[model samples]
Target chain A: SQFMNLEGKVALVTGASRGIGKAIAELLAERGAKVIGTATSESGAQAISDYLGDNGKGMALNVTNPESIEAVLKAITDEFGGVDILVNNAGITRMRMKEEEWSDIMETNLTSIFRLSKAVLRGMMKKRQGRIINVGSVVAAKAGVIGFTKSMAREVASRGVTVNTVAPGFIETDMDEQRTATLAQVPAGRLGDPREIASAVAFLASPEAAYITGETLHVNGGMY
Target chain B: MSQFMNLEGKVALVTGASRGIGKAIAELLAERGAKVIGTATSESGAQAISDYLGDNGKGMALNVTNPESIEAVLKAITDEFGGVDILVNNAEWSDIMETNLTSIFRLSKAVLRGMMKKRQGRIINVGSVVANFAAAKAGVIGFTKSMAREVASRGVTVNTVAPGFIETDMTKNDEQRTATLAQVPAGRLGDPREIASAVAFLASPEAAYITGETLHVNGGMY
Candidate 1:
């Protein structure tokens, strides 16, 4: 069906060197989207480029910096003609004892998504089509994390594009060591696999998901 | 939190009570000690439901499109059980021959008013995965959304459970089933018991806060 295939499209997946982003990129490419991945380091970009093989390419860009994002946009437009799918998977988290320590985490986790998504809006709107998937944490609903996710979801929904977040809880990536230690709290006992998170991201990018926007798909094993 | 939350001894009405998903819901709520009344449009079906559930369960005929029939059933239940705490609109017409637009709209409007009046009830509507697919039955999506909002704050959690191609007598033909099964990413038809579990959750007191939502238990079909 048209919902299952994405042959001619080009998808730009950020933070695609490792973890969930990498898994998302691979799945999209396997489903026939020409995948363009992004990373902050040259080695990370090389790793993504190598992983995706013929249907994928990679670039180095700092998502938090405006100039770096602009250059990456130019590179994508120049190489692929135009972008079809943009996965804002690049994010960071820092645990702190007080609210004062949340600034850098907020900048990297939330602000970078806002900036990069804003830059991509014009291209997507001109084409009158695009899919934007933001990688959100389960903590966005939990009291500890900031409320930027809810705000960001509402802000970008009306822009001729679908904006959604995939909130994965205690996935079995490198980030889940501390999370797994507190596994008693999760309703589903085991840590979620990276493939499970990728399946959710792929669904949001599919044509079957056009009606679903400004929503968060919790791959948390019923944690929230 | 108890603004409209007094379900202590209120009666509940559940439809499609002969077997599978409906039977599970009838049992769960009856065990919770509500004056559970189930329905089956046929006498044999009614006998099976009444026999399975014992004392708390009694079956009646409910033809959703017919107003007089629905009124008669509701009046009988109200007379016997006092008032309704919940109404599970699980009786559905999934016949491929049925006209998509007319049936769903007519049926939803028929049952909505009775639940609205008591000012306190949970109306759990059963929708299908086809409700999500535009080509399948486009009218059902709009019908569900409209009804959900109309009854959201009236001390009611108006919601729908869209089950995918579940393993049931309705899907008995293998050729017909395969065509429907291909659309689901999960690669198989969902079990009726799984759908029963979801319905059980939505009908519980724990799910009182959740309103105007369509929980998809479709094994990832859209």
Candidate 2:
């Protein structure tokens, strides 16, 4: 379907160095947005700039650093006039669930978003048009991530800035070698391609998903 | 600052708020400015709802399968908060049709009268991403489509949030967890709060246009 358009928009995606974030950045750019993909390392940023061709470039972002966030956003703001779309996609794991690591996880998984969205919204509010997509684990969908995503979506939905979360069920990333036993749980009975999740993200970021604010769109195949 | 989360002066009746996802929903509804009435199966369960809900809502014992229990909860709503503005059917068990499916139908029929009269109300059902979701969806999809159509002109929405492998008493075992995790692409269980988040979204005015939809929150088990 000819579902959405982003002919003159600028999209900023974090953690685009690899994985789902990489696909989201590329897809949005292909749809016509000047995409700015972010990564923590210079090489990662370079990788993003390479794949994007000319629609956009890549940059390093220290999501936890207010200074790093401000600097990159400034450069984009100076060039594109301000981001028209933002994706909070950088995340981490809890090697050990302790208070110290809790805040560490919060810093990137949650706080990075709290801070980045704060910056992006300034331009979004004035322009009165923008998209903010938060990446979350399917596990966290019930853990409080979806709740937070919903709250944010509602907070900004009226501002012409729609917020939404995409929970991609079992994805076939390189790291997930696979399992003969686990496939039994999947109703779709297969590993979801990254493109599947990417399409869902791409669709939601489009103008077609305007009425779909404050929702958790899952791209996982169902079993139980 | 914004009435967007406004449930002020509105009466909400929720079921199975004793613990787990139900309690989370009840507390959130109360927090969002509704006069919430949470239901449990026993006096103690009801009391727990009351304790947590505090001033925002109340709790009562309800047997979803029984007619009298439904009426009594409705009475409490009428006597105190005037009438119902929102109804969430969160109770579930075996016998997919009778337990999970038809029970929601029964409750919806009873509360919808007050809803249609008011010309605006919300109904949210919690569903599983299993046989009922796939099998029952055949029934649920058309029902929600027709039902939502029937009530849309009057401002009512019926929607479902289907969760995939959420952790509860059932998946607490690690041996099972490892096996379950292996099947998932995301390799994790959904949290009750995650399920709660979807419910709260559908319950709120923010989700008005979203009806007859099933939101799946599985960790890539598909």
Candidate 3:
């Protein structure tokens, strides 16, 4: 209770309808922060609004499109008087058999985070205090996948805002279904709970975490 | 090559090695096949450590606040072990409750100079979690941060392992102990072995790339 308090703060969480994003939104709201959650579908948005009570609202946003990004930013600013925390959690992953598939994955997973963070930079900088938590995967560190996460972490550190990646290893979520067979390799002996990942994200988003910036926190339960 | 390297036959010098975390670190390092030279303030304490480690692990009596004492012990250690490979600056003074600054500063300067002479070294300072959260202990935090930056580029990785409210002989009073334990998120006192594991990890060669960083084992307290 000493360090993890987030009272009176406004948080804008993207991809907050389900999984780790949803868990972060709920935890922040419960801690007395006003939360605005974004989702792709109307049902998803409604689900987020229902989960987070009076202080929490839901918005429909497509992070891949610039127009959608601008609209959500304006709505949150007008409603909450500029966001104090921005969780850039909107991401997508498509199994690639060809280069075009890789491009689609990169566009949603990497490009959307870049554009959305750039849009929110001016407001956060003007406030002189803000928290930006990017949801990155352990795949960023593992060899063979891609290095987009490392690039994104470096791009956002100089703005007095911290941009960190929580590289979760084999979390038990809908995303894990795609890589179910690889679960045997994780040293934790099972997939990590989404709530455990949320706990780490909550710590990074708190005000007491000012000294930690531009670092990748591995919550992999001892897995590499 | 990816940082998880082992320390098999290295010679390590651990100060304040009479008991508690220092003794635990010496025993664990010896278990991993490193010849350890543990130091304490009293002859009886040094003899106790010698009994634990035999000839491969020995003890010396030296006051960390005194430079002459530190220099003599360093010479004796180098003569026996042929140059210290790792130095655990775990020797600290937390007893003088009124004017703690004088002793902490004097002790830190003495050990830092010794590690600086050995160009290739890993220096691990056991700091407190209060170094970050508590305002009264601000002096220790400032000194640790400054010293960490000073020796970072010298092929010697300097870091502070700031442990949270762990169950040790240091927390003797019930009122102070309960107050410290309440701040930790784990809702209980931390184990001594947990602190030792983190210290062992930082002392290992795998932590070569980690410098000027404070590794917190405070159970999500800070």
Candidate 4:
């Protein structure tokens, strides 16, 4: 806890209305960072604001849209002096998806990271310090993020900005029908809590993890 | 072919060296002029390794799941070759955990004292990307990292070489092979030699700076 104190820092966490994003936002705020949680919808944004109250703010952000990302960054810069840490947590998943649906998932899950990370890099580079933590998945777009993180990390190392991905497996999120098959694969023989994934994200986002960059940390129940 | 990758005078120990990736690793290490000791679960299998290695190396029986069995092999290697300079924990190609993960821990620990005293050593673990073996192999990755950190200052390097779908007996079925091949960017099944070459590189003196790393030889499947 002493090693991970994020006091006087500003963190922008995407999709923070619930699940792993909510847990990451809450923990960052708890660690003394002025947190900004974002959601695609007004209601979800408002829910994050209610929970964060005074500690931070919450707003609507469509990560796939460059305009939406710029608007949110401008607002956060005005109030919190820009983000010291960026957590690209907004994403979507579709099972038995069609061609259109798969493309939609890539836009939200993969391309959005490029847009959001580009928007935040200037402030981080100017300050010569920042953390870019992308929330990835065990079953989804990790290979893309890992490659991106490695390339970006090499480019930004001198500027002191670190890029890392946290890949989660079989977490205790809402799921069924596929639950039995999934649960059987985890070696720990149980589903992981969102808090566990949050813990891993927070570690990578901390000053203590400055030297660890371009790495994918798997936070599964020994299911990597 | 450079001296950097040379293994002359080094004593290398490989497990499950009767066939497949394990056997390939042993042969490659021997080709690099390292005095090799290969192990198999059965005497016949061990003899198969002995027959192929000839004077370059010898094969011994080892039940990696049994601590006593591990101790006996370590003792034999100590008496025969002084101690292991390069240890390749390549087996399980398990009781899943005991064979794939625990054996590496037991053997690595048994060899560390001698390696540390010598102030130079290579500990390479063979891991797989198979679905059912993911958990145990993942454990190997984590363990390698921790051990690498602990003994790094002592001149001992620990690492894992994780192989993807390779052309071996384990991957004989065409139906599954076709499905996996579709995902690999390399557009073909990896040869066991590809994985063996990776282990030999890590075990060589050139890889001293590398430790606690899982060098994935997945042909971009990852």
Candidate 5:
């Protein structure tokens, strides 16, 4: 645990009102970082603030909007100096076959990481130490974002910044009517905990994991 | 950082641990409380590991390409410890296919009975990114995927740790190191310790769900 201590660090986690993002925020804060969790609505952000208390603050952030990203980063910079860890955990999932539907998913799930990462890069590079952890789903873990992670990780490694992705499979957080079918498929014979995904993220976020960049750590309960 | 990554009371077998990445992996596994058995190609090489390991574990000589030698190591491991709990196949390119790829199959098949009986085990194969030996490495990935699925339900996991441009005896030349550095986004060659860290992470109890995965520790070098 000493090797993973993040006493003086600052972490920014998106979509921290619930599910995997919330778990990531809570774990990072417990590891001693001053976490700033973001949500899409004021009430959601307030809920984050209530749980985080003195460990961190919460803010409303619409990841699809560039202006919203800019404003949020400015506020964090002004309040807590800057972010040392960036967790791109906010996004939407869909099953539609329409062009517009696909585009919407791409804008929110894929491009949003790029924008948020780019916004936080300068501050991290200046400090010569940072962790950029993108939370990806097992269904969506195939390509797009991994390529982007590799590209960005390569560009910033010299500055002591590491970028990585934690791809989760059939977690208990979003279970529905298909629970039994999904559980049967996972080799572990059960769905994963969001904290399991958070553990992988926290590992990458640690100083001991500096050499691990541009890689995908799959926490899929052996289903993938 | 929590108790999630603990390896206490586990027995691990690592091949080619006399030096470089294998040595690092062996040492780290021992540090994490596993009773490690490191292998080398010669008695002297094995002794070197034994000298460093002290009471934590022992070192043995192994010729991965030979079935007799492979069985000998496993038998010895079974005698000392009940059986191997974690198997790390870290030997290099064999006769190209023999040592690097085939040995993994032979060893995994050899160890599976005990692992499956216990219903808990880890098999980590060390792979690399080398131009001349690309085919062998590719074979490792395919083998790992098949084996992982084959044993997933039985409480065992299989995975590979692929390294890119790591600093080792193989990349000792300054000219080669400089050239590789240019290709690496990290702006430097990776230390063998870095590769060991990745392997350790994959071999941990917390990594139970991550089977059939190939984790690359390349400093973003693809």
Candidate 6:
């Protein structure tokens, strides 16, 4: 690896209690960055704290609340200086969710990035160095998150900050009851591990990815 | 718009460049200022490539299945252009598994030594739109992801640009063309130039951070 090491940088990872968020938090910490992992509940936050031990801290954050996001930002600024890397990996979805059933997905997934990003931008803007990553699904056709990523990337491209998304398909999670159905559609004829998706994020978050912006990295095993 | 894809000193090698998407890619790379080496299976096909590339790049015979042919071209290319900085595997599916997937494995592996030494390179493979969901195109996607992971630790980046139906020799059949038009919401078949743009972008210096990525260049199809 000739590039992409985050030394002494502070990163905030939302939804760090389990799944993709946990993997990303650990990987970024391993790469020498101070990580602050977030979970909605105290016990979940404590789990993240236990895992991140000396690398950084873990705390509570409900993305829908501006005060919660602001509180975490204050803590990071007070302790580790200011946040350098931000991962909006906290996503909510139902497996059998019909297209018309959930109306709040936009707020839950897309707008959450807008709120958290606005809260953290001052530190990043002042320093002129940062990475904002959004975890998304491979099928981002109507997700509206991709549109936001593109516009934000253009706004921040010249500011030394890069914004990108990692869209994963058919990842192997315990919640996957559709794994068999997905494998038939996947070319690798197998399921993806959370780390595989996490690796792509680390690459995008690394210094090596400085030139890239407004891109959706697909980590599916050839299944969209 | 920025000068991110500069290829002043970079040399590129593209396969299946006799016509269609490969030819378009070869010409576009040359236009971007890379020294190009476009390959074809036959001597005449190779001559056609040389005819078009002229001083921009040379056309040479490279049969992907033949080890001697690959060896000869590698020597010629290394001797002539110094070393390959960009390698585009744009050949058609010769055998279901052999030409479409394995050939890329062999060709890409062949060029790995030079790139590893330089610690910089780009490998772009052409794929189909169906790979995303179609059962038939699964192997292509699998091979692409596998190869990408293996070489990413080096300075090299490997990616695939999967294009939808384009107006080419393969799609000249009138009935099939009509069927394709109905499927593409863009209401038209894409030109070779569109796919070329995607290829040129990936082969550029700005794309160095992007590895193991698959970019779909279809005309809003799939």
Q: How many Å off is the CA of B11 in candidate 6?
A: 1.0
Chain A alone, TM-score for each of the models? Answer: 0.86, 0.91, 0.85, 0.94, 0.93, 0.91
RMSD of each: 16.4, 19.9, 16.9, 17.4, 16.8, 19.6
What is the lDDT, from 0 to 100, of the residue A190 in candidate 2?
81
| Residue B217 lDDT in candidate 3 | 82
Clashing pairs in 2: A141-B194, A142-B191, A142-B194, A143-B191, A169-B220, A170-B185, A170-B220, A221-B222
TM-score for model 6? Answer: 0.50
Between candidates 2 and 3, the lDDT winner: 2
Interface RMSD of 5: 14.5
lDDT (Cα, tens digit) per residue for candidate 1, span B1-222: 242322447577787777767887787767666667888878777788888778876888667556577668877877877656677767522241133323334434444555567666676766543311321222333334445666776666666777777777667766867788788899888877777667667766778788766778887864
User: Comparing 2 and 5 by TM-score, which wins?
Assistant: 5
Summarize candidate 3's per-residue lDDT along B35-94 as a digit string, tens digits. 899989988888988999896689988776566776788788778776677667674112
User: For residues B7-121, what per-residue lDDT tens digits would candidate 4 score against the true structure?
Assistant: 9899999998999899899999999989999999899988999999999889999998888898898888889887899999987313544456556777888888899999999
Query: lDDT tens digits, residues A1-224, model 4?
Result: 57799999999999899889999999998888899999888898899999999989899999867788889999999988979999988887541224345435655766677668877998899999999998885345333466567657877889999998898887777545677788889998888899998999999999999999989898888885
Residue B202 CA displacement from its true place in model 6, Å:
0.4
lDDT of 1: 0.68
Report how far residue A121 has shifted in candidate 5, in Å.
0.6
Displacement of the residue A27 alpha carbon in candidate 4, Å: 7.1
Please list, in the order the candidates appear, how each scores on TM-score for chain B only. 0.76, 0.89, 0.79, 0.94, 0.94, 0.92
Badly placed stretches (over 4 Å) of model 2 are A1-3, A94-99, A138-142, A176-178, B1-222
- Native-to-model Cα distance after best TM-score fit, residue A38 in candidate 1, in Å: 1.7
For model 5, residues A112-197, the per-residue Cα lDDT tens digits are 77678878998899999999998875444224465567667778899999999888888877635667877888898988889999
Model 5 Cα lDDT, one tens digit per residue, B1-222: 348678888999999899889999999999988899999999998999999898989999999878899898899989988699999999722244444555777788888889899989999999864322443454566567757887899899999898888877667666866777888788887888988888898889889899988898888877
Candidate achieving higher TM-score, 2 or 3: 2
Compared with the true structure, all predictions reach lDDT values of: 0.68, 0.74, 0.69, 0.83, 0.82, 0.78
Error of 2 at A150 (Å): 1.5
In candidate 5, the residue pairs with backbone N, CA or C atoms under 3 Å apart (3 or more residues apart, or in different chains) clash, namely none
* lDDT (Cα, tens digit) per residue for candidate 3, span A106-190: 4455556656766776787777667777776533311101222333344445656666667777776774365656766777677
Q: List-wise, what DockQ does each model earn?
A: 0.01, 0.02, 0.01, 0.02, 0.01, 0.01
